[PDB]
Amino acid sequence: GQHFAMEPQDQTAVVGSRVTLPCRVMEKVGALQWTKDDFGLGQHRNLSGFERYSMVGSDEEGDFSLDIYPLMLDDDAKYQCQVGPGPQGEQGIRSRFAKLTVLVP
């Protein structure tokens, strides 16, 4: 079944930098999406309106990491990697929540 090969971890970073929240999925059947404070960022890598977020990894590798750049204070939140159910009855999955902390020097 579909499952995480890698899940995001708590991170602390400095404003202005790039951050990568890791998410790798094996045997992905459902549609994938990140939540930020439980707000859905978009499925199928389509993050319209979030000009500083992207998901440039490849499907083959199951790379669905979230990149953020440049980091801003508003990005200080809790993030989760989500995969919806498959068309064949495959259940969806949810990664641990990762707390992204933003510092200012």
Binding mask 27-46 vs ligand NAG (x if CB under 6 A, - otherwise)? ----x------------x-x
Contacts (CB under 8 A) with a copy of itself, residues 83-102: 84-87, 90, 92, 94
| Residue nearest Na ion, CB atom distance | 47
Three-class secondary structure of residue 74 per DSSP: helix
Site for ligand NAG contains 56 (CB under 6 A): no
For residue 63, what is the DSSP state? B
CA-based nearest residue to 11, from 75, 103, 101, 104: 101
CA distance 67 to 41: 12
Sequence-ordered list of residues with C-beta below 8 angstroms from that of 57, at least 6 positions apart, any chain: 63, 64, 65
Site for ligand NAG contains 88 (CB under 6 A): no
Where does this chain bind a copy of itself (CB under 8 A)? Answer: 30-31, 33, 35, 38-43, 48-50, 80, 82, 84-87, 90, 92, 94
Where does this chain bind ligand NAG (CB under 6 A)? Answer: 31, 44, 46, 48
